[PDB]
Amino acid sequence: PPKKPKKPGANATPEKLAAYEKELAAYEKELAAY
Numbered sequence: 795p796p797k798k799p800k801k802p803g804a805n806a807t808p809e810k811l812a813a814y815e816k817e818l819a820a821y822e823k824e825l826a827a828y
Contacts, residue, residue, distance in 0.1 A: 796824035 799817040802810050 795828055796821055 798821055799814060802814055806814070
């Protein structure tokens, strides 16, 4: 099963949140595919 990305806290940067969005989207796509 595909890894779940950990939610970034303590003042995460927009690019990090963007990375979280891409990894979370990736996770969703792969989770559906699985």
